[PDB]
Amino acid sequence: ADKAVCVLKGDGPVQGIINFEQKESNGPVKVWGSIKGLTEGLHGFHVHEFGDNTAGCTSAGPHFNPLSRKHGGPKDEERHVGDLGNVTADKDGVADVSIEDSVISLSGDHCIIGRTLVVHEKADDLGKGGNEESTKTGNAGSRLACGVIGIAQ
Amino acid sequence: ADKAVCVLKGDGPVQGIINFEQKESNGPVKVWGSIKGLTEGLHGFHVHEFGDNTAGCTSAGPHFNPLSRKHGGPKDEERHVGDLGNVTADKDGVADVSIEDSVISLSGDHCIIGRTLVVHEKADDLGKGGNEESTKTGNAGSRLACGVIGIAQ
Ligand SMILES: [Cu+2]
Ligand SMILES: [Cu+2]
Ligand SMILES: [Zn+2]
Ligand SMILES: [Zn+2]
Numbered sequence: 001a002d003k004a005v006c007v008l009k010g011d012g013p014v015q016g017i018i019n020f021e022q023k024e025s026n027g028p029v030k031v032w033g034s035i036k037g038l039t040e041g042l043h044g045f046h047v048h049e050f051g052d053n054t055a056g057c058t059s060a061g062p063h064f065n066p067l068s069r070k071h072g073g074p075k076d077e078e079r080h081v082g083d084l085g086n087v088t089a090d091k092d093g094v095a096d097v098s099i100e101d102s103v104i105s106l107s108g109d110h111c112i113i114g115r116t117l118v119v120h121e122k123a124d125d126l127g128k129g130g131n132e133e134s135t136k137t138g139n140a141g142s143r144l145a146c147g148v149i150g151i152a153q
Numbered sequence: 154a155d156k157a158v159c160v161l162k163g164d165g166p167v168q169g170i171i172n173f174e175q176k177e178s179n180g181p182v183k184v185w186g187s188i189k190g191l192t193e194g195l196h197g198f199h200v201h202e203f204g205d206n207t208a209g210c211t212s213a214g215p216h217f218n219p220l221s222r223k224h225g226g227p228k229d230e231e232r233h234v235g236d237l238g239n240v241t242a243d244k245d246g247v248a249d250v251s252i253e254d255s256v257i258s259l260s261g262d263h264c265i266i267g268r269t270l271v272v273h274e275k276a277d278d279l280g281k282g283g284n285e286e287s288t289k290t291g292n293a294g295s296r297l298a299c300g301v302i303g304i305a306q
Pocket of ligand 3: 063070071072080082083136137138
């Protein structure tokens with residue numbers, strides 16, 4: 001029923017439009033659209049806490065985590081709300097994102113509007129890397145592109 | 154107590170950083186910041202409806218208008234929720250934006266989080282133009298710079 005869109009831009013080649021659609025308030029969010037300018041492989045894909053690019057993607061803060069828990073995969077019991085896992089770019093560096101998630105919302109307590117969508121340099125290890133960063137940001141590395149998540153028509 | 158921040162960019166020289174603050178949920182929103190690259194004089198300053206910059210500033214839509222009203226000034230009972238009036242750029246082309254509004258909100262139904270703030274090329278005539286375009290957008294003309302409104306720390 002209610003929708004969201006997001007333009008990922010950054011300092012290098014990474015760009016693409018990512019749409020959000022949530023049919024009812026408690027139901028799942030569909031997350032789709034394509035990202036280009038990526039290296040082939042897995043890339044971290046998160047909603048970050050703050051919708052702030054005063055200083056590019058770095059101002060977007062840590063992973064949105066209103067339930068104050070640890071980082072994991074999208075299917076893990078232990079996850080921040082923004083923990084949307086990996087996207088996969090192909091040989092041309094095109095990641096055709098098609099995602100369904102029941103933990104993010106476009107309304108209520110876990111609402112992602114006005115927060116930042118970030119696509120990372122490396123793979124999100126899902127908390128399995130065996131280091132301090134792994135259980136925090138998934139060791140996905142730097143923030144290649146972002147955008148504020150905004151209400152769509 | 155709760156906070157929002159917005160970064161305006163366009164296809165030209167106009168750029169700035171606009172903060173929103175609100176002490177209680179019923180209370181007024183302090184809107185402060187600075188816009189540069191502007192021509193000297195008055196400039197349209199509105200919260201548009203859609204936090205969508207896929208087509209640049211255009212995809213933002215018309216002025217945020219839940220109460221389905223006509224366009225006016227922030228003083229008028231006849232105002233869109235997102236009619237924040239004018240901003241005045243100086244001889245150096247810099248507007249030191251400081252505005253107080255009890256109508257806009259950072260939580261609730263008149264929520265401006267995830268919508269687009271726009272700075273316009275011309276003065277907003279505040280609905281006193283004597284034309285159709287006056288009572289819809291304010292004859293402010295083209296959209297110089299914009300950005301989504303995001304929750305800040
Ligand atoms: Cu991240
Ligand atoms: Cu406008
Ligand atoms: Zn996380
Ligand atoms: Zn208006």
